[PDB]
Subunit: 405 residues, 2 copies
């Protein structure tokens, strides 16, 4: 009955971003949120300099109408000096500093020349083609705000200003555990209705990729005491505690009881497919997310619910979770009204070079394989029914957590 | 003059993928190329189980007509091994093993309780709702081929099969360094035509994010001897050595001379923007890549020439460099024929919900901003000239490296 949107907002509304901070050299700062504005120690460019390669000119000698001969020149970290002879232009080259008292710059390609005077064409505006000191960054100004996620895009600019290190929010810490008599670890035999734990490994891998500190307390044994202790310890060392499965998501049993007695926890039933149940509330000193047990359900729930929560918790000012984009279905899709289906899809170029989703296969949450052969979701609007070939449909490309990049 | 495509092929055609291998537990394998096929050790599912919450039944019961008791239940962990007498039924969770003789299962929503047990409202089709042992994965069957780069997709599936670890190819080793008297580290003064070193930091980052093992040799000093040892060292400890800037890309000087004396290095001039120069060739025991000095050039070149190289080298069987997709420019673009301009661009939804690039701004290589403001390249076909609003265009979305 509850909508992904309503729940997403319900979660994020109560989250107060972390603000503890440490200061590390740029090379360690990838994907780390910035603690405080970065303030440029130097003007960049450091001095007014030539837009193109061509000729630096005084506006005096232009309609002067006689051609102007190259008296001198300025290039890279070599400047120009020796008082500018009135009447002459100066062969200057892109990036190069202008000589004192210049007034414009003209691309020699515009202007044909000769062996004793260079002749210009257009009337050539004032200040033309002088990239000025600090046009790109001014000293004292704000280069990257608090909250900017550091990528290869921002960190080299920082390095360019002579800075060796920046303040950044501490990594988010997320404690992780599973439970249930059915669950066994690699090695052990399989009892009767037994399976190996997979959700925990799945949530770990994505937490680490997302840049969290994971604390993985294993498979708490099926006893209301083991469990109380799992929570005391998880809550004591994390900002978020995540049940990969086994702790209850609505069904009564001693796990619902330890949860209710150890914090304030809601038990949502979201209008999504796959999934539906999702457990979530405050603990003594952390947040709790309680994944449903089905691998696909858990994964998708985490991906669309918990992932966005860790972003806000990190200090990140962005809206961390890919954009969708409308594309034509090349496959008939079985959608049932009443639930928002995050079916899995395959974005491929048609013969025309445009995009079109194909379905991955059977969308039953009885199998994980759709994450592999897909590269995106097909978000199928809540109220929509079945979809025919050629109809339009929203699509959300996966991200790093599932392939490429 | 030489075309991107030509260089790519030429680089890739000599590169032999790594085959050294180590075996680490699943939780450490993210992003890591798999060494040999994952063979399924068990049938998955491993026992017929309920696709649904409800009760296990038989057709001869149902058939009769009247309701029927509930002689026990099969739960998640708990399997029912009771007698299961006739004209009764067994309550079943979901993913619960189906009891012996179960010949179908019925949804909790097609039943009404009774004083004397349970009534089945609707039809019961034989075999209905029984997820059958082996229908998803057959034991003995290759689940994942060698060369599968491992993500959240494949690694949980492997744990589902009881598997604690897997052989993966060893991480790729990349030595990185820069040189030149203009180059200063943080803290030091900015003498005359000097700068603070940035191409190295940029390249370290991308390398690390790409899952490579980085060996950063700092800024080698402007001495033919320092540089020679730097190379001998980088080559003796890496699969790839990468001058982030400083070592020559064409120009004559003691760097070109050291390179030429120490390996077989081409000096290409590519038909691209931004960029043009790029040095590449074998060394004694590794590959050498020579980035151009300029930051945007050295980034773009790394991303489009080196990234795809490091991918082939890793063991990965995919094509490790996003697909492009065609889209309308909503901004007038300045392109010059003769080079393939990798302009920088901003994808977004219009009012109609469909994609369209805008330019980031000035595409001059005198600034780094476009990699931040943008979320993609506009790949403007070599021969194309200026492109007007509403024209169609290829667009390659950025990736993780630029956020």
């Amino acid at each position: 009955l509850m909508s992904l949107d309503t729940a997403l907002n319900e979660m994020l509304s109560r989250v107060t971003p972390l603000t503890a901070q440490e200061t590390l050299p740029l090379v360690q700062c990838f994907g780390r949120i910035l603690a405080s504005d970065v303030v440029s120690p130097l003007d960049v460019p450091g001095f007014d300099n030539s837009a193109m390669d061509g000729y630096a000119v005084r506006l005096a000698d232009i309609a002067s109408g006689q051609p102007l001969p190259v008296a001198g020149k300025s290039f890279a970290g070599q400047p120009y000096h020796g008082e500018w002879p009135a009447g002459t232009c100066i062969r200057i080259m892109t990036g190069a500093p202008v000589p004192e008292g210049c007034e414009a710059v003209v691309m020699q390609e515009q202007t044909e020349q000769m062996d004793n005077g260079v002749r210009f064409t257009a009337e050539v505006r004032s200040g033309q083609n002088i990239r000025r000191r600090g046009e790109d960054i001014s000293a004292g100004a704000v280069v990257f705000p608090a909250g900017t996620r550091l990528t290869t895009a921002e960190l080299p600019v920082i390095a360019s200003l002579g800075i060796a290190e920046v303040p950044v929010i501490r990594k988010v810490r997320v404690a992780l555990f599973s439970t249930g008599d059915e669950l066994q670890l690699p090695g052990q035999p399989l009892g009767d209705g037994q399976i190996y734990d997979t959700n925990r490994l799945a949530v770990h891998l994505m937490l680490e990729q997302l840049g969290c500190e994971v604390i993985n307390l294993g498979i708490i044994r099926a006893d209301p005491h083991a469990l109380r202790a799992a929570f005391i310890e998880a809550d004591s060392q994390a900002d978020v505690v995540i049940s990969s499965g086994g702790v209850s998501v609505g069904e009564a049993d001693y796990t619902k009881t330890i949860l209710e007695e150890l914090g304030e926890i809601a038990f949502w039933k979201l209008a999504i497919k796959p999934g539906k149940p999702f457990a979530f509330g405050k603990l003594s000193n952390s947040w709790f997310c309680g994944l449903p047990g089905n691998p696909v359900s858990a994964t998708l729930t985490f991906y669309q619910l918990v992932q966005p929560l860790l972003a806000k918790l990190s200090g990140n000012t962005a809206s961390g979770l890919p954009a969708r984009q409308r594309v034509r279905t090349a496959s008939r899709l079985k959608k049932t009204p009443g639930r928002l289906d995050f079916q899995r899809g395959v974005l491929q170029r048609n013969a025309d070079g445009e995009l079109e989703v194909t379905t991955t296969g059977h969308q039953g949450s009885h199998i994980f394989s759709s994450f592999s052969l897909g590269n995106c979701f097909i978000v199928l609007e809540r109220d929509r029914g079945n979809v025919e070939v050629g109809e339009w449909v929203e699509v959300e490309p996966f991200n790093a957590l599932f392939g490429g990049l």
